[PDB]
């Protein structure tokens, strides 16, 4: 019983950053070997845990939050960061534990792409994980842009450990 990472990383449709969706993964084998050894990833950064130890530790559950953003804002999906996305679309908690995975999706998402939206105007700051749907602007991703403008698909795997059986373990 392997965890449904394919439903997170091999999905055809991704949420926009202003309205990111998520999957809750539990009661399965979290074989992370599939992800950290993947040649599709441009970046992979973990907070509080080394990637090579992910298969040696258990969680109550994990949350896979996924969305598409422009490449030069990939650095904002981290604790302690600021910026329009960090502040008004996906607030990443400063005590975050988990891994952030991202890759270049230019060959899937760009168009010769008025689909993915992010916030421009938000009256106040978000608290961690508080997605809000209600102002918004299209990225308009193109096939002929630099890496900072090309779309990067992002998956954030947060790790939750509670007074629970801890059923999400690697091999």
């Amino acid at each position, epitope marked *: 019983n392997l965890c449904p990472f394919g439903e997170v990383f091999n999905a055809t449709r991704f949420a926009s950053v202003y309205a990111w969706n998520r999957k809750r993964i539990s009661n399965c084998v979290a074989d992370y070997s599939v992800l*950290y*050894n*993947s*040649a599709s*990833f*441009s*970046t*992979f*950064k*973990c*907070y509080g*845990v*080394s*990637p*090579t130890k992910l298969n040696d530790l258990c969680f109550t559950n994990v949350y896979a939050d996924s969305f598409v953003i422009r*490449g*030069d804002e*990939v*650095r904002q999906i*981290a604790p302690g960061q600021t*910026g329009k996305i960090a502040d008004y679309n996906y607030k990443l908690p400063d005590d975050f534990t988990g*891994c952030v995975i991202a890759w270049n999706s230019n060959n899937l998402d760009s168009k010769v792409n008025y689909n993915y939206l992010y916030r421009l105007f938000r009256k106040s700051n978000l608290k961690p994980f508080e997605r809000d749907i209600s102002p918004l602007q299209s990225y308009g991703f193109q096939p002929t842009n*630099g*890496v*900072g403008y090309q779309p990067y698909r992002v998956v954030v795997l947060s790790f939750e450990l509670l007074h629970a059986p801890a059923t999400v373990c690697g091999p």
Partner: antibody, heavy 119, light 99 residues
Framework: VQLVQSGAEVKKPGSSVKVSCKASGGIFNTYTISWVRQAPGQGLEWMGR????????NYAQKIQGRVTITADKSTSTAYMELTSDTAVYYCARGFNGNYYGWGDDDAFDIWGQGTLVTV | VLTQPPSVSVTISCTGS?????????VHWYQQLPGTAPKLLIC???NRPSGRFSGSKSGTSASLAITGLQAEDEADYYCQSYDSSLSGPNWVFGGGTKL
């Protein structure tokens, strides 16, 4: 951590060279190896980086198609090889103090000795 | 390429663009003594490894501050940052300043 590179060598111009680099220190926090070169009297130029886990590597556009980098997990080495200058080629591990793994905002902290290749 | 003064007798400047420094990406600093590989002195905006130095960013520019004319640290200083243009990820080192 320690990164040991190859010694100096001379090749005929137009030929190929293979430069090894072995991360013998530990390899426990090394996820990626980058290569940077420095021509005599010049500054440093990034040439490429390989992620040891995935085997994927990115390259500077100016040398694309004539450079390859191979990660050999079994020996903890990264091979930098070129086809078809007299620059010094340095091996360095990527590192970031805020997170484990690799990314764009990381830095090259531990550098090898530098292998010169001349014609 | 990041622009730097050929030499400084103090502070070492580093000027880029909004595709690399004004982009928000971290600017790292190195000290290269002749005969060897460069040593990192600043990671991120202003963190440092064990073993006098500070720095900051402003707009599309960044700078390294070295205080005290100690010994003879006539090293070649370089700035490094991630460039988000071209047609793919690349890292850029500055021209290099002799101190």
């Amino acid at each position: 951590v320690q990164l040991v590179q190859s010694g100096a060598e001379v090749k005929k111009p137009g030929s190929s060279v293979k430069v090894s680099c072995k991360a013998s220190g530990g390899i426990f926090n090394t996820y990626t190896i980058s290569w940077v070169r420095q021509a005599p009297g010049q500054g440093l130029e990034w040439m490429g980086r390989i992620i040891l886990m995935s085997g994927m590597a990115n390259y500077a556009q100016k040398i694309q198609g004539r450079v390859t980098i191979t990660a050999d997990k079994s020996t903890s080495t990264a091979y930098m090889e070129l086809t078809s200058d007299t620059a010094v080629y340095y091996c360095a591990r990527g590192f970031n103090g805020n997170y484990y793994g690799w990314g764009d905002d990381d830095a090259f902290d531990i550098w090898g000795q530098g292998t010169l290749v001349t014609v | 390429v990041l622009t730097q003064p050929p030499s400084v007798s103090v502070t070492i400047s580093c000027t880029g663009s909004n595709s690399n420094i004004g982009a928000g990406y971290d600017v790292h600093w190195y000290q290269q003594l002749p005969g060897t590989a460069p040593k990192l002195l600043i990671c991120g905006n202003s963190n440092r490894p064990s073993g006098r130095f500070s720095g900051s960013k402003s707009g599309t520019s960044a700078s390294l501050a070295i205080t005290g004319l100690q010994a003879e640290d006539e090293a070649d200083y370089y700035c490094q940052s991630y460039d988000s243009s071209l047609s793919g990820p690349n890292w850029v080192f500055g021209g290099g300043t002799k101190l």
